[PDB]
Ligand binder design. Structure first.
Ligand SMILES: Cc1cc2nc3c(=O)[nH]c(=O)nc-3n(C[C@H](O)[C@H](O)[C@H](O)COP(=O)(O)O)c2cc1C
Ligand SMILES: O=[N+]([O-])c1cc([N+](=O)[O-])c(O)c([N+](=O)[O-])c1
Length: 362
């Protein structure tokens, strides 16, 4: 078995290939979107992971889509995240911050000034986001119709990603993961379904990938390419955002472009929680020959599926989501073939310690 063997991931070395997937838990303080000591304890409990990838973290106030999600733009956010990374490092762990802009998956009530969120085009996402009620409890509310970004606003978006990566370095993160998946802003530009622009940021695949590649170049320049990962979900449909009528060819174009930058890793979210068609081994081979860094697979994996694909030389590591919510010591349990704690989905979002830090270790 290979799941418990080391792997060099850009600038750090993971001691195993069992990674903690990015998981939105909506427990941050408002006002201020500030990480908490309870969040610090949760991440410290999981520090035996080969790599922790944080919950989605907004790059700016405009980037916020969910009440209770943290940011990485203000002094108070930087100071709170510094305590969290210090606690992970005290336990000999490694942690990446997942950075996003939600684009049209948002609501006017949590935007600056109470105004419309932004996107590639002015089309409603036709889904829900998570807000908080008068008592601070999580609630699902229909998304607000966005306005299209003006051409002259695009450099500011690139600069916000650049600044958030500068802040992540100061906060003591080991790596950053750019959120280019799941129907958020970068994916909204990538997909023809959500991008009807007639300037240089819409139409062809080269134009649709222009924004995400500008962001990759900016953050590599700010820090170093060996500190940068990216999450993509380029095959299937995710939160009403499909990948267009040429999804395989368009995915291989983007992956070839990413490879030119020499980034640390490519993280593929293979399916939505509601399911989708499995990746073919032929498509996995085409990805593998186009990218020369670490490849992480995710989406309803078991340890058995992970071992199979790692042994075949097609991926290098696996990110587990819901098994990591329920099992702080998932590495030890998989190594010893011990039974897992049962999941409690009712407490995935919002609340406090219950369903968060109260899943026991062996
Ligand atoms: C409660 C919950 C929150 C999630 N939040 C995020 C997120 O912040 N960013 C992201 O890229 N994916 C997010 N996902 C997807 C997970 O990263 C992961 O890909 C998925 O849970 C993997 O499948 P598994 O749970 O079957 O292992 C979330 C999933 C769940 C269950
Ligand atoms: O649980 N969620 O609300 C949720 C949130 C995010 N996110 O980045 O904010 C995701 O990427 C996914 N996701 O991919 O399933 C889910």
């Amino acid at each position: 078995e290979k799941l418990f063997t080391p792997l060099k991931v850009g600038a750090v070395t993971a001691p195993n290939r069992v990674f903690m997937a990015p998981l939105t838990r909506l427990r941050s303080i408002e006002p201020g979107d500030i990480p908490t000591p309870l969040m610090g304890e949760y991440y410290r409990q999981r520090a035996s992971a080969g790599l922790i990838i944080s919950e989605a973290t907004q790059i700016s106030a405009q980037a916020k889509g969910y009440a209770g999600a943290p940011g990485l733009h203000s002094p108070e956010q930087i100071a709170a995240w510094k305590k969290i990374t210090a606690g992970v490092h005290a336990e000999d762990g490694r942690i990446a911050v997942q950075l996003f802009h939600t684009g049209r998956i948002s609501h006017s009530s949590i935007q600056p000034g109470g105004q419309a969120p932004v996107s590639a085009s002015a089309l409603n996402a036709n889904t829900r986001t998570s807000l908080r009620d008068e008592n601070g409890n999580a609630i699902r509310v229909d998304t607000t119709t966005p306005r299209a970004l003006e051409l002259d606003e695009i450099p500011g978006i690139v600069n916000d990603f650049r600044q958030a990566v500068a802040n992540a370095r100061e906060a003591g993160f080991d790596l950053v993961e750019l959120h280019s998946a799941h129907g958020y802003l970068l994916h909204q530009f990538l997909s023809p379904s959500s991008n009807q622009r007639t300037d240089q940021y819409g139409g062809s695949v080269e134009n649709r990938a222009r924004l995400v590649l500008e962001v990759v170049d900016a953050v590599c320049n700010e820090w170093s390419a060996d500190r940068i990962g990216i999450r993509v979900s380029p095959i299937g449909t995710f939160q009403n955002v499909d990948n267009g009528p040429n999804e395989e060819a368009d995915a291989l174009y983007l992956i070839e472009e990413l490879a030119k930058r020499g980034i640390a890793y490519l993280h593929m979210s293979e399916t939505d929680l509601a399911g989708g068609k499995p990746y073919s081994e032929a498509f996995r081979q085409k990805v593998r020959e186009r990218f020369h860094g670490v490849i992480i697979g995710a989406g309803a994996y078991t340890a058995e599926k992970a071992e199979d694909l790692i042994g075949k030389g097609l991926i290098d590591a696996v990110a587990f989501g819901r098994d990591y919510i329920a099992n702080p010591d998932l590495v030890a349990r998989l190594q010893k073939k011990a039974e897992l704690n049962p999941q409690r989905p009712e407490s995935f979002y919002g609340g406090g310690a219950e369903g968060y830090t109260d899943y026991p270790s062996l």
